[PDB]
Structure 1
Amino acid sequence: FKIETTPESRYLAQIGDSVSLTCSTTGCESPFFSWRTQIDSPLNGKVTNEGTTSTLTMNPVSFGNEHSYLCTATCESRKLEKGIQVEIYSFPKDPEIHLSGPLEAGKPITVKCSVADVYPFDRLEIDLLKGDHLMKSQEFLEDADRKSLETKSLEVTFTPVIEDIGKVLVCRAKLHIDEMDSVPTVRQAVKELQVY
Structure 2
Amino acid sequence: FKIETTPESRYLAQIGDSVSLTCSTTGCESPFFSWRTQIDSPLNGKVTNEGTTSTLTMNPVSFGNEHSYLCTATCESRKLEKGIQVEIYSFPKDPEIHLSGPLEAGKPITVKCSVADVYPFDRLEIDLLKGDHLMKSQEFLEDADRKSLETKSLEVTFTPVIEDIGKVLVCRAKLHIDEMDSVPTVRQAVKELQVD
* 8 Å contact kept, 1:30–1:75: yes
Q: In the aligned structure 1, how far is the partner of 2:106 from the partner of 2:82?
A: 64
Q: Percent identity at matched positions?
A: 99
User: Across the two proteins, how many residue pairs are aligned to each other?
Assistant: 196
Rate the CA distance shift 1:9–1:142 in 2: closer, same or farther, 3 A.
Answer: farther
Q: In the aligned structure 2, how far is the partner of 1:181 from the partner of 1:122?
A: 16
Q: In the aligned structure 1, how far is the partner of 2:7 from the partner of 2:163?
A: 52
Q: Which runs of 5+ in 1 are unaligned?
A: none
1:75-134 CA distances to partner (integer Å, 9 max, x unpaired)?
A: 223322100111234333221100112234664322110112334434331110112211
Which moved further from structure 2: 21-30 or 183-192?
183-192
* 8 Å contact kept, 2:68–2:85: yes
* 8 Å contact kept, 2:174–2:184: no
Q: In the aligned structure 2, how far is the partner of 1:47 from the partner of 1:54?
A: 7
* 8 Å contact kept, 1:179–1:185: no
Q: Which runs of 5+ in 2 are unaligned?
A: none
Q: State the Cα RMSD in Å.
A: 2.9
Rate the CA distance shift 1:182–1:108 in 2: closer, same or farther, 3 A.
Answer: closer
* Other structure's SS at 1:122 match: helix
1:119-160 CA distances to partner (integer Å, 9 max, x unpaired)?
A: 443433111011221110112333435432211211112233
Q: In the aligned structure 2, how far is the partner of 1:23 from the partner of 1:159?
A: 60
Rate the CA distance shift 1:108–1:92 in 2: closer, same or farther, 3 A.
Answer: same
* 8 Å contact kept, 2:178–2:184: no
* Other structure's SS at 2:141 match: coil
Rate the CA distance shift 1:154–1:143 in 2: closer, same or farther, 3 A.
Answer: closer
1:45-87 CA distances to partner (integer Å, 9 max, x unpaired)?
A: 0111222221100112222212110011122233221001112
Q: In the aligned structure 2, how far is the partner of 1:183 from the partner of 1:20?
A: 29
* 8 Å contact kept, 1:171–1:189: yes
